[PDB]
């Protein structure tokens, strides 16, 4: 904090710099952020219904952002940047800060723009929700959408119930006459009961799976499948 | 530490800095990507070649070569700065960065490892050719098995049907390579086999279909995934 000021001015010139001589070039870009953000270890405190004390960016200065947008320049993307240095969590300037880029030409900056801002969001998923102490909120819905069978069965048990999930990897298995397939369904059935909660019921069929493979001599054959069977059965 | 404008500093201003970036916090992409832009961007134009495509550029000591595939099974935070050290002082020897993200992922930094592949990856969307380049002795920049790092039958007659059934063939090879599980490796046979044949080599196919139903049948793969084994007897008879 005392001599990390300087840490985070030095990046930030080692970037400015980075991007004078390259704008196109987004690896200048990618080192602001990292000046910006990594001193940032937990989110801000929010009170009343997820309220930061945070004083968002003044209405009108991001009046301006919107308004020169449908013909902009080099000049324009800079003050925007610069913006986003001072509020660290407006995060509706990333999103413009990319359209100006991609107008510019500049588009893989503006992806790795994208990838920075999911990089942080992918750190302290609590973000995604909060508000500016003027109650408009961190992220935008307009700037939230901006960013086999292993993976569907396992898909319907995080969105509907897992009644569903089931009932998902029912109807599949009445479609599957190869023993291969459907002993990978009951396979299925092992690992989307233990990611909901369930490790002794899940156990007894790591069981009869690594037991059954091994029996079926995959230990000859596809001895991934059994060798990670195995540890999980214990 | 300041930081200059005359070239020359400005690269051992971007390395000065990446050190630190990683040193730090050695999980973090970004300070690997700065070494990256470092070393890369002074590059505006792929070297001289001409001896199909022989550059005077001398490939990585070979005894260093070995050590480095050598201790990967003791992956430490020693190696991995050695490994670094070296795709720094050697621009080009593109094989250092793939081990390089073998051993972060070993060392579980998974995002480090990610980004070591895309910064490479671009480098090359930039200068092509570094591709099809080669060193002093004949050793290429960027090996298949490197590139790789960068759904069989489906693609091997693709590349039988674009370049020929040499090339076919060639890409097999790789592939086998590093297929361990003796199901896949059984698999590239199989294809191998519907290769020949879709050539006209019936014959040597049917010697090869046949050589699999019976290895098949050996296995039991009737009492499990018996379509395999079905096609395999309409096909060798």
């Known amino acids: 904090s005392s001599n990390d000021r300087a840490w985070r ?13 390259q704008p196109e070039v987004a690896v200048g870009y990618r080192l602001r952020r990292h000046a910006v953000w990594a001193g940032i270890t937990a989110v801000p405190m929010s009170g009343a219904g997820n309220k930061t004390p945070l004083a968002p960016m003044s209405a009108d200065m991001v009046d301006e952002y919107r308004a020169a947008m449908n013909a902009p320049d080099q000049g324009l993307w800079q003050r925007i940047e610069q913006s986003l240095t001072l509020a660290p969590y407006w995060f509706e300037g990333h999103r413009l800060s990319a359209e100006v880029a991609e107008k510019l030409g500049f588009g893989a900056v503006a992806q790795a723009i994208a990838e920075e801002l999911g990089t ?9 929700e909060l508000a500016f102490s003027d109650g408009s909120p961190f992220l935008s819905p307009e700037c939230s959408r901006w960013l086999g069978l292993a993976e569907e069965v ?31 369904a009951l396979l299925v059935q092992a690992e989307l009961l233990a990611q909901e909660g369930m490790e002794a019921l899940a156990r007894q069929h790591y069981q009869h799976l690594w037991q059954e493979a091994s029996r079926l001599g995959l230990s000859h054959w596809e001895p991934g499948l059994v060798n990670r069977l195995e540890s999980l059965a214990a």
């Open 120 to 128: 942080f969001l992918q750190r302290l998923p609590a973000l995604r």
């Open 154 to 184: 396992a898909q319907r048990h995080g969105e509907q119930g897992i009644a569903a999930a089931l009932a998902l990897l029912d109807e599949r298995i009445a479609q599957l006459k190869e023993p291969r397939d459907r002993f990978h």
């Open 9 to 21: 001015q030095t990046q930030l010139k080692v970037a400015e710099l980075l991007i004078e001589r």
